[PDB]
A paper describes a structure:
The human AAA+ ATPase p97, also known as valosin-containing protein, a potential target for cancer therapeutics, plays a vital role in the clearing of misfolded proteins. p97 dysfunction is also known to play a crucial role in several neurodegenerative disorders, such as MultiSystem Proteinopathy 1 (MSP-1) and Familial Amyotrophic Lateral Sclerosis (ALS). pmcp97 is a member of the classic clade of AAA+ ATPases and is an essential cellular enzyme. p97 is composed of six protomers forming a homo-hexamer with an N-terminal domain (NTD) and two tandem ATPase domains D1 and D2 (1). p97 is an essential protein in regulating cellular homeostasis from membrane fusion, Endoplasmic Reticulum-Associated Degradation, Mitochondrial-Associated Degradation (MAD), Chromatin-Associated Degradation to NF-κB activation (2). Critical functions for p97 include the translocation and restructuring of proteins from large cellular structures such as organelle membranes and extraction of ubiquitinated client proteins to facilitate their degradation through the ubiquitin-proteasome system. Here, we present cryo-EM structural analyses of four disease mutants p97R155H, p97R191Q, p97A232E, p97D592N, as well as p97E470D, implicated in resistance to the drug CB-5083, a potent p97 inhibitor.
D592 is located in the pore loop region of the hexamer at the inter-protomer interface, indicating that interactions distal to the D1-D2 interface can also influence the coupling between these domains.
Residue numbers in the entry:
A (entry chain D): 21 to 707, 728 to 775
B (entry chain E): 260 to 707, 728 to 775
The structure:
Amino acid sequence: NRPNRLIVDEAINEDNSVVSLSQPKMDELQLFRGDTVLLKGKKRREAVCIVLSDDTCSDEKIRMNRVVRNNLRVRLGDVISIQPCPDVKYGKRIHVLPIDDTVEGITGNLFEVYLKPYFLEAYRPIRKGDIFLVRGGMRAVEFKVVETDPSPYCIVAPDTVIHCEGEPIKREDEEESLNEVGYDDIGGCRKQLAQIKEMVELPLRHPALFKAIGVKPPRGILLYGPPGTGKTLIARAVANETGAFFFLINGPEIMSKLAGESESNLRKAFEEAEKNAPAIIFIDELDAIAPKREKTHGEVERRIVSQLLTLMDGLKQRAHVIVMAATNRPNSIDPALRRFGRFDREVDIGIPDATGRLEILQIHTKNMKLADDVDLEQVANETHGHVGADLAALCSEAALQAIRKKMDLIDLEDETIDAEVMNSLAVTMDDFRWALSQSNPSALRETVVEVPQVTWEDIGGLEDVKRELQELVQYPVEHPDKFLKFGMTPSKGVLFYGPPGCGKTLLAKAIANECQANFISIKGPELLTMWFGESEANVREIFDKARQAAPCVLFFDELDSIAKARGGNIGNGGGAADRVINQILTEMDGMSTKKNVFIIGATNRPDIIDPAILRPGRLDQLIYIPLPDEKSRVAILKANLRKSPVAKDVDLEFLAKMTNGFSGADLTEICQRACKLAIRESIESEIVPEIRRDHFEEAMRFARRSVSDNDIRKYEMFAQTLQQSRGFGSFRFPS
Amino acid sequence: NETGAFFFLINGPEIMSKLAGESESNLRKAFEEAEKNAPAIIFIDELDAIAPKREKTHGEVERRIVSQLLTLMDGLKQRAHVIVMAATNRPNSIDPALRRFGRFDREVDIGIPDATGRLEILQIHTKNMKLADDVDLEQVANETHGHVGADLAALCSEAALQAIRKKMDLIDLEDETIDAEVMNSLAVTMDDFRWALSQSNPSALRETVVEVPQVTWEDIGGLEDVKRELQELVQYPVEHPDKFLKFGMTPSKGVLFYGPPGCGKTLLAKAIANECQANFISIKGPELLTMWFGESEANVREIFDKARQAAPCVLFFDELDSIAKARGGNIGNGGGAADRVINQILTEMDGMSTKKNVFIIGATNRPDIIDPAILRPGRLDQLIYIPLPDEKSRVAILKANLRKSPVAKDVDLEFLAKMTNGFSGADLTEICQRACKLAIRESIESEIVPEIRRDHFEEAMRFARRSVSDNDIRKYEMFAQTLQQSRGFGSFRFPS
Ligand SMILES: Nc1ncnc2c1ncn2[C@@H]1O[C@H](COP(=O)(O)OP(=O)(O)O)[C@@H](O)[C@H]1O
Ligand SMILES: Nc1ncnc2c1ncn2[C@@H]1O[C@H](COP(=O)(O)OP(=O)(O)O)[C@@H](O)[C@H]1O
Ligand SMILES: Nc1ncnc2c1ncn2[C@@H]1O[C@H](COP(=O)(O)OP(=O)(O)O)[C@@H](O)[C@H]1O
């Protein structure tokens, strides 16, 4: 038994002496809330930390940060021994000194700038011989214990004096640098990063297991994403956290060699990593190495591609090397590389969402000190087209602005800077706004994927439609047991038709938010570009991106916008079928029905929609969104007024009754006009900060009905023709 | 390995990775080495990457390698007993000079295995490990209908890796070698396979899949007149050809199906392939339209070639008029009723071998816009009209559609058929689909019973929509009577 062995895993808190344990873990080992333990690992070394309460990690695993993982020489997946230590122990004299690998540039006091704001009111239990890292001064510097009283009996106390000599010491090869790349340095990538964690955990941490079994290990991992997403960061972090010898192979570095030298350089890079097993061979750019799809210009290019292909599939076990290649675009790769044995496991790393970029900002700003009025929530929202490298550049530029506001008048003309100035240099929002306005996003044209923040509370009315949407996309994904028993497959998608500006997009986004799945949206111009551009082959890429991002919903806005541009029911001498809808149907028919992917079709002119899409099998479920009723319009305003401060004066119920033929869009622009009037009257009166009732009274003058009465009749007759519930309404069984 | 011949593997990129002139020596030395060890088999991994001399023609070394391969290929004037077997991905991606008589004449096409084929692959790849009692490979093959042989091996490996992850974490056998008393007890369950099945991306989705469909005559409701006619033109010449050559007249080349949509135009074609035990190739409307909108009509030849060497097989064209509907119809634009895709289809059908067992099935729902040039005796002369199901034809439809979902004796199927007068085959399917969806919804809602009750169909019958109205019924009937034209000669008799 020996219930003291726990699985080491990454922590969540950014502190130093923190251990995250579940309630039953301390309840089994008679451990309390505010106690200390003694973690013991390999190489005859121990560590003293503080246990904390957790409820998310696991049942029998320990969450330990990178700062303390390097102290015990224990990586992820290894096992350690934990035991309580209720013995009283105080600190008297702690002597520490940093290592010269990171102190080059520090001048002045070292206690007041790094130790005082870290050791006081913390009661961090230090251990003689441990390496702890502290952050501050827009950098990261650690410290090393060289001589102290024999451990245990080392706990920082307010009445403990600290003195240091001043010169640093050199480190050894036993410990790794804390400034390197780790799992805690990656943000905005959780679904993709977890797959890579679980994919290479066995062959790297346990190389001897695969040598004794017939299981084929994954020999190739291809990474996607626009340049700057962080593929190299993830590749280096996996190697640095799994104990594998990382070997970086740059793209242009090999191609820059002469004729025949590139072959030797690429070939010598494989056995070198094979000897240092386990190892990870990473390729920076692979589209620039083997673009053997359309280029095929030059014998040396093909020779390099063939050499790479030969060295790729020729890894018949031997060592335990895993090759992870990175590229920019999936189609820009040689198809011969995707053969089974060279590159079979495929990983797509997308642009982080709003909740992902905040983690990147927290990672990139953890070394510097910010002011109280600095919030990263608005920065992530305002930066919705940027990538991982974009935000690091934004942070660097924002940090540079603060230096410019103090270097000019202080004029520290010294060979090295002091640590007592940079700590006080707090970056404010004004520094970030200057850099945000000039940073050009590198990721704007390709489709962005989210899991939208809009929920059911933002949608007013449409209660009949909500239950229907929560009936076909949430039941097969949560309770499939009642589906395979009957032997019938679920629906492939549902089409939305009705008057424009009623919520055709809000329902699709809310159903994605509730189901916790990705959301891909295609607008009208996006569909029209591939028609006018005479290139309909881009549907396959959209469907592939949706498939491997499962679960996800495939939303097509105004699907009839391609038939409206060429007439409609009659139009020109052609019919109601074109190349883009052709390719969409072709890719939907061959789409995997067992996957969690879903397709949402939105249209405002259902009379011109091709019937070929509407058969049972592609899009059979049709839900009509009518105009909001009296109590449906009230909820629209109750949901739209949650952002702007409006007092109790405005009567929303009375406004809904007068707005009879008003769609959802009109009620939004009414509030927009009222708030614009409020802003205008505030600015004009500045030469008050609340929305009054006469604002809406004047804004109601220009209340234009976007939907007239002529199309209402057409929509209603179309709905009743497609429903056809008459005749069989009184159909009953005799006995 | 089973014939006792010395196998010599020649990789594609391995030869191309050599320098200028070294690849020639490496390829040449690989022939006499196998010749001395006769008998031997010389296998080429990738041949499209060695001799793509069809459009590439870039570089003197590439052409030199192709010419060296061609010279060493046809230069094997007996001598040894070596047989060269080359492998490639796509038939058109090969140099036509290699297909000359003497180098590569025998041609083998290996297709994607069907449902009954993938089960054997799973049994082969799982015979070394131990599975649990609740592990069945029948559903895995059905759920994996776009995967290939290597895909299923990868799926099995990934499923086996999941089981190890659930035990290595807590056991922690930190040893240089594993013990045999642990892996035997590590039984892989269905939960391990389902995780790997959901993330495995099939590599074979766009090219046409070939089967020998599992649907039989018991699944088709009614249409007894049509079954005997189908079993009359495709099963007699293939089983009893002795009475065909004696009369000196060739059998028919194909039969066209016309009628209202959703009546069984595909079920009959699949059942006639199942009964005859032959391959089935299906082409949908969008597949035909892609080669029209893409301005590339040359892909008909590949489809016909794939059908020919997969004999016996049936060539099924779904909604053949879907290409005329996209451009108008009877009048449409300033053009007529003939386009490039139908042009190529006719060109390849006229030159098709009449002695082969291949067959062509044409399906259409707007026969008025079908080009008469296809309809002459010689290409598509047999026409069979599928009318709306009658009273006793609709009962069998439900009796065949209810074989999958558990339904008690309560629901009266005979009474439902009489009220559904103007209902096609498709409407009766969606009625049952709605009823079963209601049953699933009421089971899930009541969970917070496992049988289909009678009020399920009673409520599902409210939204019974007739996909075929009355206006097109008259047009279909008048078209059928115009094409039949059996009047006038009904009382034609011989005097003596
Ligand atoms: N998801 C991320 N989390 C944290 N930092 C990131 C992320 N993505 C990129 N970065 C930062 O951007 C910098 C540049 O990354 P880069 O080398 O361009 O990645 P790639 O090679 O994948 O394009 C790195 O120093 C890294 O710190
Ligand atoms: N039912 C509704 N409840 C609340 N707001 C709505 C509703 N329908 C539309 N809106 C508002 O109208 C705006 C534009 O909607 P739009 O995308 O044009 O709808 P649709 O996709 O149906 O045309 C959205 O920002 C949304 O906030
Ligand atoms: N005669 C029939 N008997 C039983 N089921 C039928 C019949 N006709 C059609 N169906 C059902 O309708 C569904 C769709 O048929 P479909 O392919 O649209 O027919 P068609 O090719 O004639 O248009 C099929 O899944 C099939 O089960």
